[PDB]
Amino acid sequence: TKALVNEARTECDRYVRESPRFYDEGTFSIYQFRQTLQQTSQGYDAQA
């Protein structure tokens, strides 16, 4: 049980790192937040 648990956790630690597929211009743009920051999100909240 100990051996498998350690091995399983080790693999589970590799998903966190972002692969090249994680970023895609068409699928999603990180810069669309500017549209929510350019006089759009008035208060210091996370609702918009």
The residues of the shown chain that bind another protein, judged by CB under 8 A, are 45-47
Whole-number Å distance between alpha carbons of 3 and 6: 5
To another protein, the closest distance from the beta carbon of 47 in angstroms equals 7
Question: Which residue lies nearer to another protein by CB, 6 or 47?
Answer: 47
Cα angle, residue 26 at apex, residues 44 and 48 outer, rounded to 5°: 20
Cβ atoms 22, 30 nearer than 8 A: no
To another protein, the closest distance from the beta carbon of 28 in angstroms equals 23
Question: Which residue lies nearer to another protein by CB, 1 or 47?
Answer: 47
